[PDB]
């Protein structure tokens, strides 16, 4: 009937069938599309009972609807109830992917050509979203889906904001300013950490709190310049350290990539490199093609986004944004 799977109901209508549970905002399943005759990925999200729930899903739904890219995931369809009252669940239907980078970096090893290519598709895709003055805020290997033909796409646009921070967060990829970060440069750091993780097959900065993540970076990045309150006094108390050479952690790595890696993983956000600049790096000459690589047609405009609204009004906003996909409307 409703094609209930695992433990709860998964009413996706006659359109999608043969539900397979993938795992994991909410439940994620792989259904078969009959309209396009190709397996797709449906994720069930059931918010509306929390303040920050309705925002991030609206933020993700909006952005993914107005974006089109070869390296950014795209919503194919959305399903929900005809009315406000009966609408309790939202079904985001997106095209199916074989795996993500987190599952890739474990159990599997990448060549320098495969590493360079992925970092490119990250950057090629990142420079589009960054061209629209929008921040991803939370970039992770788990948020980088991978196509069978080595094509990379980006997800998790819930925490996205235009160019509460502290709310529910793997804190291995946060920037030195997001220790406790509101620019493009905070994403580059994450992408920098990812490159370091693709290069070592292991997390560059382990531990997800102050005694480790911002402490282990001091072991590699070293003590900062005096350019750099309770986080301030804590660092000054800690003994001075030196920067361990990137060609010691990564001795069998490309000399080109290590240069870029250091340019991406600088301490201070200022002059911490930029998109397009990173694309122009010698490590990415075989793939860089500014004539083909798409950019944002126009920055993400305002007035329509100011989520200090109650959950009651946010649900209404979800309804409008979703009505564009509703079969009868």
């Amino acid at each position: 009937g409703p094609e209930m799977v695992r433990g709860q109901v998964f009413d996706v209508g006659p359109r999608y069938t043969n539900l397979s549970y993938i795992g994991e905002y909410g439940m994620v399943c792989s259904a078969y599309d009959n309209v396009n005759k190709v397996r797709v990925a449906i994720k069930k999200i059931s918010p509306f009972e929390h303040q920050t729930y309705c925002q991030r899903t609206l933020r993700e739904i909006k952005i993914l609807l107005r974006f089109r890219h070869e390296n950014i995931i795209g919503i194919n369809d959305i399903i929900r109830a005809p009315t406000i009252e009966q609408m309790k669940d939202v079904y985001i239907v997106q095209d199916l992917m074989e795996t993500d980078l987190y599952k890739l970096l474990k159990t599997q090893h990448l060549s320098n050509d495969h590493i360079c290519y992925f970092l490119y598709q990250i950057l090629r895709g990142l420079k589009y979203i960054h061209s629209a003055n929008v921040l991803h805020r939370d970039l992770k290997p788990s948020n980088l889906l991978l196509n069978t033909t080595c094509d990379l796409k980006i997800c998790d646009f819930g925490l996205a904001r235009v160019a509460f921070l502290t709310e529910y967060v793997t804190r291995w990829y946060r920037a030195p300013e997001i220790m406790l970060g509101y620019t493009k440069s905070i994403d580059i750091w994450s992408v920098g950490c990812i490159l370091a993780e693709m290069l070592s097959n292991r997390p560059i900065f382990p531990g997800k709190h102050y005694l480790d993540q911002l402490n282990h970076i001091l072991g590699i990045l070293g003590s900062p310049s005096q350019e750099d309150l309770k986080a301030r006094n804590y660092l000054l108390s800690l003994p001075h350290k030196n920067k361990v050479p990137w060609n010691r952690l990564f001795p069998n790595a490309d000399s080109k990539a290590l240069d870029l890696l250091d340019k991406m993983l600088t301490f201070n956000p200022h002059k911490r490199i930029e998109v397009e600049q990173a694309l122009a790096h010698p490590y990415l000459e075989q793939y860089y093609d500014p004539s083909d690589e798409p950019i944002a047609e126009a920055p993400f405009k305002f007035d329509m986004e100011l989520d200090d609204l109650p959950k009651e009004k946010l649900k209404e906003l979800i309804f409008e944004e979703t009505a564009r996909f509703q079969p009868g409307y």
Binding site: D100, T148, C150
Partner: peptide
Amino acid sequence: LVKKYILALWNE
């Protein structure tokens, strides 16, 4: 002639 290179990585 198949560009974009030929490798399928694989399973979740």
